[PDB]
Amino acid sequence: DRLYSFGL
């Protein structure tokens, strides 16, 4: 993911 790859 990109935006969801931010862990949070």
Angstrom distance (rounded) from CA 8 to CA 1: 12
Structure tokens, 5:
């790859």
Q: Which long-range contacts (CB under 8 A, 24 or more apart) does 1-5 make?
A: none
Angstrom distance (rounded) from CA 6 to CA 3: 6
Residue type, position 2, single letter: R
Residue 3 neighbours by CB under 8 Å, 6+ apart: none
Angstrom distance (rounded) from CA 8 to CA 2: 11
Angstrom distance (rounded) from CA 5 to CA 8: 8
Given the structure tokens 């993911």, which residue do they identify? 1
CA atoms within 13 Å, Cβ hemisphere of 8: 0
Backbone angles phi, psi at 2, to 5 degrees: -110, -65
* Secondary structure, 3-state, the chain: CCCHHHCC
